[PDB]
Amino acid sequence: SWIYPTVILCLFGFFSMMRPSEPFLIPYLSGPDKNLTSAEITNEIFPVWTYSYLVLLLPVFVLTDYVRYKPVIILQGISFIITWLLLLFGQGVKTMQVVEFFYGMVTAAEVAYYAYIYSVVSPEHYQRVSGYCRSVTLAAYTAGSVLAQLLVSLANMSYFYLNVISLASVSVAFLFSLFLPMPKKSVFVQWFQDLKECYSSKRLFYWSLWWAFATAGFNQVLNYVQILWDYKAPSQDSSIYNGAVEAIATFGGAVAAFAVGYVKVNWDLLGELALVVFSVVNAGSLFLMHYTANIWACYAGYLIFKSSYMLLITIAVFQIAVNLNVERYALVFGINTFIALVIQTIMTVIVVDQRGLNLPVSIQFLVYGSYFAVIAGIFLMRSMYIT
C-alpha cells in the first residue's frame, strides 16, 4: 500500500539530510583544508547558492509535475554527489561557487522530494505520510549533527573524513531514490490561467499565503539565530553548545512533524485554529529570544519556535495536498517555496544588508518577532471576520 513508497522516500530523505559536515561547514572551508578567507565565503560563495536556488526553483516548479517527480529526485541525488565530491576535492572560490550552484539545485529538487509522496499515495494517507516525510528529514539533521559532534568530541576526527561520511550518506540516499516507485501518468499565457484553476480551492490560498510568508521569516530566523546567540553570550559559549542546541531544537520539530502524522485530528476544522494558535506561539517565541537577556530562555524560545513552525508547515503541506484537487503538487509547493525565497531575499536585503537598513541583531530579531506577530494577527483577523 502506502508503506513501500513512504519507507523508501523516508530513507532517501534521512540519508540525504544526515549530513555531518553541515554544522561544521564554515570551519571546514575556512581552516587548513581550503584556506579561504571569511570575506570570500559570505560575499562571493554563499550568495551563489541563493541565486542558483531561485533560477533552479523555476525549472522545478515548471517541469517537475510533467516528469512525474522521480527524475528531479534522482537529479537531487546526483547533485548531492557532485556537491560533496567538489567539497571534498575542491580548491579556490571558483569551484566553491559551483558547489553552491549544485546545492541550490539540490534544494530546488528537495521541493520535488516533498511533492513526490503526495504524487503516489492515496489522499486518505496524505496526513500520516506528511508528518513522516518531514519528520525523517528533521530527524536526519539531528542524527547527523549529533554524530558529527560525537565524531569531533570522541574521535578527534578531521573535517575532511567527516565530509566524506556526508558524501557516503548522500550516496546511499541516491541508491534509495533509484528504488522509488514511478508515479502513474497524470501561447504560454494559457499556462498562467491554469495556475488560477490550481489555486481555486480558496483554502489553499490561505495555507499557501501562510507558507509563502512564514517560511520566509523562518529561514531568516534560522540563519541569524546563531549570530543572536553569539551576541547574547560573549563569555565562552562556543559552537559545540550552539550547533548542539540547534540539533535538539530541530529534534523537537521532528517530533512535532511526526505528531501531525501520528495523531488522529480532523484538520479540516482545526486547521485555522492551529494556524492562529501556533502563529501567535511563533511570535511569542521570537519575542522571547530578543527581549530576555538569558541564553537559556532564548534557547527554549528557539526550541519552541522550531517545533511550532515544523508542526505548522507539516499541517500546511498536508492541507495543501488534500485540498489541491489537481495533480500540480510540485507546482504549488515549488511556487510556495520560490515566493517564500523571494520574500526572504527582499526582506533580508532591506532589513539586515549593509545597504538596506544595516539593522543590528537584537532589534533585528525584534523585527522578526514583529513580522511573525503581523502574520499571526492577519490570520487571527480572518477567524473574527468569519465569525
Swiss-Prot record:
Its main location: membrane. InterPro entries: Folate_carrier (IPR002666), MFS_trans_sf (IPR036259), ThTr-2 (IPR028337). Keywords: Disease variant, Glycoprotein, Membrane, Transmembrane, Transmembrane helix, Transport. Glycans are attached at residues 35, 156. This is Thiamine transporter 2. Changing residue 83 to S: Significant decrease in pyridoxine transport. One of its GO terms (cellular component) is membrane. The chain crosses the membrane at residues 1-18, 44-64, 72-92, 101-121, 135-155, 160-180, 209-229, 243-263, 269-289, 302-322, 332-352, 361-381. The lineage of its organism: Eukaryota, Metazoa, Chordata, Craniata, Vertebrata. SUPFAM superfamilies: MFS general substrate transporter. GO terms for molecular function: thiamine transmembrane transporter activity. Pyridoxine transport is inhibited by carbonyl cyanide p-trifluoromethoxyphenylhydrazone (FCCP) and carbonyl cyanide m-chlorophenylhydrazone (CCCP). Changing residue 77 to V: Significant decrease in pyridoxine transport.
